Design a protein around this ligand. Structure first.
Ligand code: SF4
Length: 224
């Protein structure tokens, strides 16, 4: 599928069916997007919403979070699991307060330098909260791309990972980047699922190679 057709079909789908009312999509800021991305990394959206609201009420700004005792952060995290996320969350808040005056930095290198924030999370923060032109690649997004373009191989191999990042850059547009990047997460979370994807509801079904061959189980590849 031509990349300009890929992006247009995904944005047209998002306009009518996409999620736009999650709390971290209303009056968006780099802090709110960062906080939601870290909570969502290993936890389902329904579990996250009450925690996100409790964290924003107690810590309205990243400086408030930075100045709080770590034990209070860990207490409020209880039930989200994967507490390395919370330790790094607090360290990153302290880095923003100390190096950046309490305001989130707006360059890719400074955001990726934060503890707990990798290449995809940095692009997510900058594209979704400020409209900067970066693509994303988490497991949801990688599964949509690998099925549509038939990318076999284990993404734990560098050459496969690099092919998937290049494909993501290619289909991600500049105009509407915030809509496209949320739409791709929506698609991998609710439609292009690990088992038995819902191809009839997918706006890529007219050009997807896995759908044409009923071969979604091959993409992405598994660990050997
Ligand atoms: S058509 Fe099916 S396999 Fe292809 S991207 Fe959409 S849901 Fe995934």
């Amino acid at each position: 599928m031509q990349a300009s057709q890929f992006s247009a079909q995904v944005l047209d789908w998002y306009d009518k069916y996409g999620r736009k009312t999650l709390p971290w999509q209303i009056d968006k800021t780099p802090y709110k997007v960062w906080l939601s991305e870290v909570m969502l990394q290993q936890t389902q959206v329904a579990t996250v919403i009450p925690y996100f609201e409790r964290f924003m009420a107690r810590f309205p700004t990243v400086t408030d979070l930075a100045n709080a005792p770590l034990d209070e952060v860990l207490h409020l995290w209880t039930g989200l699991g994967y507490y390395a996320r919370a330790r790094n969350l607090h360290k990153a808040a302290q880095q923003v307060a100390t190096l950046h005056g309490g305001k989130f930095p707006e360059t890719f290198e400074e955001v990726a330098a934060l503890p707990g924030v990798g290449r995809s999370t940095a692009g997510a923060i900058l594209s979704l909260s400020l409209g900067k032109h970066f693509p994303i690649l988490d497991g949801n997004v990688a599964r949509v791309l690998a099925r549509c373009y038939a990318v076999s191989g284990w993404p734990g191999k560098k050459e496969v990972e690099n092919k998937l990042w290049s494909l993501s850059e290619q289909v991600t547009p500049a105009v509407g980047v915030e809509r496209f990047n949320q739409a791709m997460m929506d698609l991998g979370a609710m439609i292009c699922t690990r088992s038995k994807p819902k191809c009839s509801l997918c706006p890529l079904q007219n050009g997807c190679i896995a759908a044409a061959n009923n071969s979604w189980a091959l993409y992405p590849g598994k660990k050997p």
